[PDB]
Amino acid sequence: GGPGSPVRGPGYYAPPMEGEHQRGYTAEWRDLRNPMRPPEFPTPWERKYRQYARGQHPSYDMVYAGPMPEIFPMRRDFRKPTRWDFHDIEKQGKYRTSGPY
């Protein structure tokens, strides 16, 4: 990533790494897309959050409110100028259309 990027290694595979670099890339670096546990805290306060750091949200019966997807015609881009959207910087940008539905 270089100067401003926090990313430290490629997403999935990389060249062979040695010592602390291999240890970090394999185990210790932040993996923020993990679905079972979030990134791990230092030693004295990982133990006391061990049983909060599993899963995502305790309810597995969540009734989906909100709009239903459109399957025909399928749109490619949903980009419109908006006046009161304070999340437009994030609403922009390509994202993967892969989810539960």
Partner: protein
């Protein structure tokens, strides 16, 4: 008048839509030539008077009615046995009625026949026109119960043959008799016998509705705490959905058959979860889909601790939560009940995913800092609009920390503020605070926290910055005034 029962029909307006295709095809001249006649003066009507006088006989129990009973008993005793007629004197009338219905034929009135196909068709057309919406619904119910079985079993050739019989025209009957295909394919009474089973199933469904609806309606309206829909369905053998739909339909027909508008809250109350799920609005030509999971997350079968957490949450959770349960005890006033359940119910159920006893947060107010300009500038800050400000920076605006950042108990809340168009400074309401984060569209209709288990598995156990924070909060008026503070020593009273 005031009764307007079936003997003296309510007068109707002209230009009314005709019930049958040939009467949509009426020439207007012939429409006008039609004369306004009572119902019994119709040939078919008069014959039906001859048929229904026995229905009068079974009730109006006059001396003349007893004499007619005697005469009809004598006529019916033509049966060799006679004992069956003797025991059936209470219901010999239905035997004559069945035989009279059988012996009906269409021809010329002036001839030996009672009425023609045209008169019968006119009677049907106008009888239908004389029906209100309730009457039309009852007619369609009769069709469902009686004709659909026979019509479904019967072949199109059989229906055309019956049409020929009704028209009673010798020439067309002879043509059909000439046609070979019409002769061969009619005689399937063994197949037709399925019609009674079909009729029995349709009638038992209608019976479920019309007879088992009022009973469970009364029970659920009396004590919904005692007999809620799930217990009702389990103990009556019916479906959960069918019982709820029966209740809704009965209430709405009670409202519609009167002239009282229905309470739209009932489908929402009996289908809260389904109302949130399946009740979106749609546009033309978009073919919307269905979402099966609210979110993408790891399944609970993948870990022993996720499995235990789900089991504990389910035990602490309801299975079907109704308008009477604990989570709705905050609707202490009838107006609260009505406003929550009538409209904006989607808003209220979406304000928070989890189920709590608040559906929102209380608002409060802040003091305006002293304006040393004074009344020269007291007019400012009053506008035509509500101005909302939400805090940002580090330590604020993180989705992962949303529930902690807008928690009233947190020393570091996000500090939203609303200035009203009258200059008042107030805090934000839970929905306004929640509108500054990413959308969260889901609900939990069965977990109710207060019924969590405790004392078996859930037995929770256990620098001067806190002192400095208490100092910050503490009042500091003593700075202006071990020389301990004492009450004033009164001097004027000495």
């Amino acid at each position: 008048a005031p009764q307007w029962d079936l003997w003296q029909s309510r007068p109707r307006s002209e230009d009314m839509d005709e019930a049958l295709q040939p009467f949509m095809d009426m020439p207007k001249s012939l429409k006008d030539r039609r004369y306004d006649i009572p119902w019994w003066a119709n040939p078919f009507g008069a014959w039906y008077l001859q048929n229904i006088l026995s229905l009068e006989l079974l009730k109006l129990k006059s001396k003349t009615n007893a004499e007619k009973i005697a005469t009809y008993r004598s006529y019916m005793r033509s049966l060799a046995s006679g004992k069956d007629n003797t025991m059936s004197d209470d219901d010999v009338i239905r035997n004559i009625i069945k035989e009279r219905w059988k012996t009906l034929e269409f021809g010329d009135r002036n001839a030996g026949y009672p009425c023609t196909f045209g008169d019968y068709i006119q009677f049907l057309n106008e009888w239908f026109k004389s029906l209100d919406e309730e009457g039309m619904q009852r007619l369609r119910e009769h069709f469902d119960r009686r004709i659909r079985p026979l019509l479904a079993v019967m072949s199109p050739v059989d229906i055309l043959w019956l049409e020929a019989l009704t028209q009673n025209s010798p020439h067309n009957k002879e043509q059909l008799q000439r046609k070979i295909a019409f002769q061969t394919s009619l005689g399937t009474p063994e197949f037709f016998d399925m019609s009674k089973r079909l009729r029995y199933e349709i009638n038992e469904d209608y019976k479920v509705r019309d007879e088992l609806g009022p009973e469970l309606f009364a029970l659920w309206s009396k004590a919904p705490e005692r007999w809620p829909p799930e217990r009702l369905s389990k103990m009556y053998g019916l479906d959960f959905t069918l019982v709820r739909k029966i209740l809704v339909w009965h209430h709405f027909k009670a409202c519609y058959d009167a002239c009282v508008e229905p309470d739209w809250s009932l489908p929402k109350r009996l289908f809260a979860l389904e109302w949130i799920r399946d009740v979106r609005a749609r546009k033309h030509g978009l073919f919307y889909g269905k979402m099966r999971f609210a979110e993408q997350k790891i399944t609970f079968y993948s870990d022993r601790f996720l499995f235990r957490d789900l089991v504990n949450r389910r035990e602490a959770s309801y299975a079907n939560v109704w308008e009477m349960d604990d989570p709705y005890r905050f609707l202490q006033t009838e107006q609260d009940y009505e406003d929550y359940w009538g409209d904006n119910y989607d808003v209220y159920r979406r304000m928070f995913p989890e189920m709590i006893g608040r559906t929102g947060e209380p608002v409060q107010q802040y003091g305006q800092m002293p304006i040393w300009a004074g009344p020269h500038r007291q007019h400012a800050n009053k506008s035509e609009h509500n101005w909302m400000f939400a805090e940002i920076g580090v330590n604020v605006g993180h989705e992962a920390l949303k529930k902690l950042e807008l928690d009233p108990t947190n020393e570091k809340r996000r500090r939203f503020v609303i200035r009203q168009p009258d200059g008042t400074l107030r805090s934000a309401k839970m929905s306004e605070m929640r509108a500054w984060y990413w959308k969260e569209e889901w609900a939990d209709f069965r977990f109710w926290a207060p019924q969590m288990e405790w004392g078996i598995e859930n037995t929770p156990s256990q620098a001067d910055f806190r002192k400095q924070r208490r100092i910050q909060s503490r009042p500091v008026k003593w700075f202006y005034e071990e020389r301990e503070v004492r009450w004033p020593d009164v001097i004027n009273a000495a």
